Structure formats: structure tokens, C-alpha cells
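Note on ligand handling. Small-molecule inputs were canonicalized before submission; formal charges were left as drawn, and no protonation-state enumeration was performed. Where a ligand contained multiple stereocentres, the stereochemistry in the source SMILES was retained. For 2-acetamido-2-deoxy-beta-D-glucopyranose, this procedure yielded the string shown in the input block below.
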Amino acid sequence: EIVLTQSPGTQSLSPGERATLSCRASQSVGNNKLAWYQQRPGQAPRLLIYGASSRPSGVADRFSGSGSGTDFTLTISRLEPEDFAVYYCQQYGQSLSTFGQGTKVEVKRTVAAPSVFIFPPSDEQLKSGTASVVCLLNNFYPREAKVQWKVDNALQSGNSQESVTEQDSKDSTYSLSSTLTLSKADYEKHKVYACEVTHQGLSSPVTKSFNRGE
Amino acid sequence: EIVLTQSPGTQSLSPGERATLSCRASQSVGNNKLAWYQQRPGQAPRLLIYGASSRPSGVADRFSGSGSGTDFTLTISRLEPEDFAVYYCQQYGQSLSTFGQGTKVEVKRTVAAPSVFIFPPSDEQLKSGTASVVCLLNNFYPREAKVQWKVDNALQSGNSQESVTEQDSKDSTYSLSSTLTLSKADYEKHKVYACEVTHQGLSSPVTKSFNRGE
Amino acid sequence: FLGAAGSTMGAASMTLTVQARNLLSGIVQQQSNLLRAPEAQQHLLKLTVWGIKQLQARVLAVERYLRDQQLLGIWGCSGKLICCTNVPWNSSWSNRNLSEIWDNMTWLQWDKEISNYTQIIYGLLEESQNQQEKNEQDLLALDKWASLWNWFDISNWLWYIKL
Amino acid sequence: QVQLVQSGAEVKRPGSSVTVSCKASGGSFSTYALSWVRQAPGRGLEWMGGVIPLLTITNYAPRFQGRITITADRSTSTAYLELNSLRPEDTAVYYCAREGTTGWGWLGKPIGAFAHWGQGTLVTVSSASTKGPSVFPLAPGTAALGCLVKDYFPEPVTVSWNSGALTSGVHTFPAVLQSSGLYSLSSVVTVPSSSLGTQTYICNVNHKPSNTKVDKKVEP
Amino acid sequence: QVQLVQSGAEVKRPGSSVTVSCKASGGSFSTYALSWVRQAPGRGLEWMGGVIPLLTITNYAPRFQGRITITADRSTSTAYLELNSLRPEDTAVYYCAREGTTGWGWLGKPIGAFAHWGQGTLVTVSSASTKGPSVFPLAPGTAALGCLVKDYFPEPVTVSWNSGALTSGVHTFPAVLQSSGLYSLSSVVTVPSSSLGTQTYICNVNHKPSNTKVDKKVEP
Ligand SMILES: *[C@@H]1O[C@H](CO)[C@@H](O)[C@H](O)[C@H]1NC(C)=O
Ligand SMILES: *[C@@H]1O[C@H](CO)[C@@H](O)[C@H](O)[C@H]1NC(C)=O
Ligand SMILES: *[C@@H]1O[C@H](CO)[C@@H](O)[C@H](O)[C@H]1NC(C)=O
Ligand SMILES: *[C@@H]1O[C@H](CO)[C@@H](O)[C@H](O)[C@H]1NC(C)=O
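Structure output:
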């Protein structure tokens, strides 16, 4: 087994930057057989460079593979707003194979602070005995941050999972929505619902304070 | 895309007259990959000429193709009576292999007039609720037979099941008839039915005229 | 033989749609007259004038008609009248039009075009034929204890055995 | 030599699927292209599509991609043309248009033209039910009379005037599609009304989907 | 070109087995290595194994060997994959992919790379049965707002506000395989506070297997 291990992190580059990736493996693939696979979520993962050197008819020339032996290389000179996705490479050498680890390239604006909000649980689901306290992190950059809820003066981890959108191409920022599940009888008790969010832009953990009643 | 327009639309040709059929292509259909087809009722479209210069086995010798480059042409010098059906071409230079739409070679006789015997409606169809006013044109030349469905001596729209025969081999001519399809109590209140016809083998429209029940 | 040597290389594309217009068979088979009779003579004459002149002409033709076979051997083109190479059209400075060359230019004018750098091309060709191509081929079959063990290359093998 | 036998006639519904066949027997079946051509009855042709049997190399007509699945079989020597989402505007006669060749029968150089054909199958797509009609003769120097067959379903109807013995100017007519998707035909004979009260012109109407064999004398 | 119309996504009881299809169209079903790949819904990609239909060469998985079954049925020209022991960690998208060839076609020399592909369907096992959720006004210059499509079955729903008239500034959030046996979803947009009583923000949801598409008020 050849554990293919590409290793740049988030390729947070500006539109128009040289998208150079690490693109290595555990050991050397036989006969340099590597294919280059662009991928978008929900679409077809598409071949770029077959044999890691030659490109088919129809694939754009700005895709360009290089390297040999154990670790290959992909460079992309111009960064278009549609190529900002996750990139992999995959061996067709030894009879067993695995794909790339995952490198996301994005639109790069500067670092920023959000407009934080939290939703109280709605009465329409509270009358069924199902509370849901939902935070919101609107128009922040970068995506990577941390969310520490204070539900009755305590840390929560296991009920408030996180749903985070990718970089919306209009505003070039991200959006987070953490959602904790609860019931109505606990909603009659809990007064503190304050997600203490930490970020480059959220240096101090702020709240949008509300209690049981609004 | 290779588009085919068989030229001309039709050819009113006597048995023994020169048959100048042709089929027109748009782009380069290389290697002279055009054929010629013919369908008779009860038969399939039969390959009479393949390759647009080569000759199939079993076909007659007066069938011959001509033309090259982009446009091609079917040639028959003296027309035997079995050579009179719809005649298609077909390119098969590429994946898409569409046909010629069909230049039908029909027999040409001398001038022949129809016999317009318009019919009062039949009681076996009156009892079910349909007025069977029928106009019938027997043995006319040419195919240009334009009957006027003159409801109260005026052409309406929606009472014509237009069925015209093939050129019958008895006396080298066609036939045409169709039934009125209106309401029964509507026919009980009409005034006139007289299919004053129009043909190119006319000097005057032959007319029979009647009313409701007369 | 030589029948369209004055034509342009587009009308001498006609020459190499036939046996380079019969040039090679005219090279080796115009020997047939001195091949038919260096020996039909049964005469003494006690000395020979042609015994050196004909022999020198003969072995001159033979060594000239072997140097070219060895030079096609050294560029991997042995047997093939028309073969392609991995050497690119380099920085070589007669860079010009495709539809000028193979439409309106004779072979002789073409020889007048690239009369220089011809030994540069001849030195250049074997480099890409050998110094990496032969060494890449030497890299092919050395290390593969797993050459019997190939799992995702069967498709090319099947295609290849038919075409 | 080469034989191209299909299945029987089929009456279908919109949105459904039909499985028509073309059983080839005689000649090199696997090497030559086994294709398909539809035609609305008595009209022009456009190529439906076709595969090869040898490698199952396929290519569909780009106006039918996603609507057709053309199989190929090396046991039954057929092609199961499974047209999906049948349309009344794709109501057509489905000749299986095998490509042609030289020979020697069916084993020479193939030509790319469709020489060897099947008799075809008129797939009728309509949402009506089987109905047998009655007769409609027409009440009026050589005149003409006839017996109309209106209001029947489905195709066909076979007619005979005086049981095949009177062919003196018989004239059958092509079909028509009415406003409710309804089939009809007509058949007339150019005999006058003067020789009608002397000798009876009897018409015989049949409906082979339902086998209602009716005879009818025409009166003055 | 080469089209790989994979069969649809599926729901099924866990602990049982599963089958999926991949009907090719164009090129050749045989003589080229059709294969099969995975990707967990959020992870990178993962290759499993393939089949070569002319010689039934099966090149299976390093780990899933013994539980995977790939066939190739050229007589109806499809390709099936049969996995076993359905489970929440068999949940991945399963793309069917064919090897490409040099030149613009489907007949020449192959490349060794997964050039032409298929649409893919997420093969996710089902725990519960169907459930229509309820949609809420999530109360907050700029008033935040959401329509929590929470604890439903099955995935997915979409969210569009005022029948898609409000189109910019949208921020949906993906559905979760949560810890209740159901699925939840969130979706927010950005509106001002002063336009609460003037413009009524009415999100529209589309839960197609549970059949609930209600207009829902947001007037906090
Ligand atoms: C000589 O050149 C002319 C071009 O003007 C061409 O038409 C002709 O064929 C050439 N002759 C030969 C023998 O190639
Ligand atoms: C090549 O040369 C021909 C004249 O022989 C000229 O007509 C053509 O435009 C040239 N093409 C280019 C790209 O320069
Ligand atoms: C093309 O060839 C003709 C004769 O071979 C010559 O007269 C003419 O000058 C040539 N033109 C070019 C652009 O080479
Ligand atoms: C080619 O080489 C010759 C040497 O005989 C030289 O005189 C000439 O300048 C060179 N260049 C050309 C013809 O462009």
C-alpha cells in the first residue's frame, strides 16, 4: 500500500496567485503513473493531467503537473473564481490506490470580525417540547475559529454541533451556525445562552445576550 | 451537424422521362459516403444506390448516382413503372447519419379531371350523432386537389379528415375523400352543403349543391 | 527516378507519397549493369584498366550506401523511410511558416535554407535518441519484481494486442 | 441469407417503455453494425441509433440520448431497443436498419449504407381502448360510392368490396388522427348509381383487433 | 461523449446488502476498465476497485475485498456493484468512473486515468422512516433570521426566501446525520430590522420524500 499524502493546508491565496501544492506519498509509485484530479462538491471529480505530465484535449492549460518518484507537484498560475476548490492526485501504478488528502484554495480577503447573532428557540418547536438554541456568525474571515458555548455557565460539546458554509463568492467571507438541541422544561430553567466565539476577528469572546423570555 | 435537403420537393415524371434527383449536404462528408434509398408500401426503404457512385447487388442499372465534393445527385434516364415511389438519400460520413427527407418520383399522365359527387349524410351515422357529408374526388391530375369544406357555402376549419390516396396504377391518378365531422343538431340547423372544389386541372369548379336533407 | 525533384515539397509531398520518388531503389539498383557483367568477359588481355577503376567506383557506392544506413541506425530510424524524433525544432533560427514550407518550396531550395546547422541537427538527434531515451528504456525493465504483478495496466495491453 | 425478423405490432401508452427486437439470422452478425431507423408511416427517415455486437461499441442519436438503450446479444442475436418515455410524436414504424455489405450474401466488405432491413413495427402510443366500428356507406357519367369506417381503435381495419371479387376502381385511403386521438379510414369504388339498383355493390368491413366482420349492401 | 448515467440514491435497512448500477452510454462498455470509487460526504475521495468487461478481470480492494462484488453484463450493457453489510460507515458517495482514451473518442489507446465520469449518488443508509418537519421564524439595523428545518427524514431540503425573490446574501447550511435518528438543517439570510413589518420574509422549503412544501412566516 502506498499512502498518498499531499501536504499543503488551506491554500488561502489571492485570485491570481500561483497555486503550488506539495503532493507527496508514502513511497514511490511505480512507473510514475499518477493522474491529477480536480474536484468540486456535488460535481464530477475531473482529470487534469494524465501520467502527471500530459494533458488531454479540453482541460485548461493553466493546470500543470510536475514532479516524479514519490512526491509530485501541481502548479496553477492564474487563480480563477471557479477553480477555488479542493484538489487531489491519485496513483494508477501499484494495484492498490488512494486519493489526495485535501487542499482547499479560496478567495483571499483580509482578516475580519463578524456581525454575531444568536437565535432563541422558537415557540412552535418549544410547544412540542423541543428547544433549539442557534448561534450565527455572519460575514467573518477566515473560516477557522472556535466556538465555546456557555449554556448555564458551562462548556458544551456533543449537542451543539457546527454547520459552516463554504466561502460565498459574493461577500468572500464565511458563515457559521451552531445548533444545540434541548427541550421545553429545560428552557424553563436555563437563563444563559451565550456562545463564546473566539477568532482573529473575535479576539474577545462576545455575546448577544438573551434569556428565557425573548 | 450534417443537414440534408433533398432537391427538389417532388418530380411529376412520366414513365420514360428523365429523373433528376439530388441531395444537398452542408459540411464535408468525405470519402463519398452518400447513399440513395426508396420505400414502397409493404416494403422497407430499399437501398438502390450506395456510395453515390457505386452500385449495389440486385438493383437495376438505370439507377445511378452522380455528384461529388459536397453535393450529390441521383440520375435515372428512362423511368420504368416500378421506379415510382419516395426516394431518400443518406449520408453516413460521421456518427450522426441522417437521411434525405424524400423527393418522391410519381407517375405523370395527361390531364384528368375529378368526379365530384358530394354525398348527403348517412342515417346510420346520423343516429349516433355525426353528419356524414362527404365530398369525393375520383381520378384527378395532378395531386393539387384543394377541396373547400364549404359549411353553409363557406370554408370553416375543423371538419376535414384529409385523406388523399397514392397515385393509383389503374389509370395513373390519385383520389381524395373525407367526411364532415360536426354536431348532429348543428346539422339540423345548417343551410347549405356544397364542396365547390379547386384544382389545377380545372377550367371551372364542378359543383353539386344540396341543403339539409335535400 | 528523380521525376519530381524540381517540384515544390508540396508537389514533392507527391515524391514521398511514392517511394521517395524511387530514390533509394535507384541508389542500389543502378548497380545492375556492372553487376550483370564484370564476369561475362572470357578474355585474357594480360592487364586490366577497369580492375581498379570499376572496383573503386563499386566500393565507393557501397560505403556511401552504408553510412546512411548506419546513421539511420544511430537515430532509431532503421528500416523506416520517414520517422519522427524527440528532438524539438530547437532555437534553430530558420523558424518559419508551415504553409510556406510544405506548399511552396522545392527540396533543393530547402537544402539551401538549412545548409547551416545540418551537422548541428545530426549531432542533436542522437542525443534525444540515446542519452535519455535509451537510459529511460534501461530504467524500464530493471526494477519490477512486480512486473508479473500489474493490475491497472491490463486495459492498455488489451487495446495494444488488437491495435 | 440475412434475415431481419422483429416482434409483433405494439400498442403503447405515453411515458411507458417498449422493447422491440430485431432477430438476425444468417451472415456475419457480430461484425456488422446493427442499427435502428424510425419512420412515421410514409414519411422521411432519421437514424435512431445503433450499436455493434462484437464489442458493444455504441453511439446514440443526440436527439435521443437518455431516451434509448440499445442492447446487443450474442446468444439471441437480437437488439432490445428499450426506448424510454414513449411519445405520440415518436409514434413511428421501427425498421431495424442493419448496415449493408458485399458478397457472397452478408460476409463481404461493409458499405455503411443500410441494405438489409426489417419490415418494421408501428408503435402506436395512445391512451384509448379497443373499439370495433360499424359500417357507414354513403348515399348520393361514372359516379362513385363507398363505405366509411369512422370511430375505431386501434389500427388496423381490413375492407373488401364484394369479398375480393370487385376491384373495378377500388380506392382505399390513408389514416387520420382525430382530435381525441382517434383512428379512421375510408374506401370507395368508382361505380355509378345507375348500375347500383341493377347490381348490388356490397362492402365488407372488418376490425382485426376485435374480429367484428360486418357485411353491408349499398342501396339507391 | 462518454456518459455514465448512474442509478439513483437509495435508502435501505442497515445490516442488509446493497446494489447499484452504472449504465454507460457512448464509447464502449467493454475493452476499457470501468471502475468504482468512494468519497465520504465531506472527505477527500477514495478508490475501491473495478472490472474489465471483455475478460471479467476484477481488481478488488485492499480492505473491502470479500465484501465487494463487481460484475459486467454486456448483453444489456450495464455494470453493477454489490456491497454488503449496510451501516452508517458505508455512507459515502459512490461515483462510477470509466478510463479515458487518447484523442477525442472512445476507441483509441487508453490513458490509465479516470477521464470520463458519472454523476454519482450518495449511498447513505436509512435508520428511521419518513417525517415531515416544521419550519420556524428564528428571532434575532440588521436583523438576523433563520428557518430551522430540524429533525426530519430524509435528506435533503432546500431553503429559498420569498419564493426566491430575495436571492442575494443567502447562507444555507448542510443537512446533518445527527444523533436523533432524524436529520436537521439550518439556513439564514441577512435582512435589516426596520423592514420587519413591511417586507414579510417567507422562506420556502422543499422536502420531496416527506412532501411538505409550506410557506412560513418570519416576523420576529
Ligand atoms: C512544376 O511546378 C508547377 C507550379 O507552377 C506545377 O504545376 C508542376 O506540376 C510542377 N512540375 C512537376 C513535375 O512537379
Ligand atoms: C503561410 O504562407 C502562405 C504563403 O505561402 C500564406 O498565405 C499564409 O498566410 C502563411 N501563414 C501564416 C500563418 O503565416
Ligand atoms: C509559389 O510558387 C510559384 C511557382 O512555384 C512562385 O512563382 C511563387 O513566387 C511562389 N510564392 C511563394 C509565396 O513562395
Ligand atoms: C551557411 O554556411 C555557409 C558556409 O559555406 C556560409 O557562407 C553562409 O553564410 C551560411 N548561412 C546562410 C546561407 O544563411
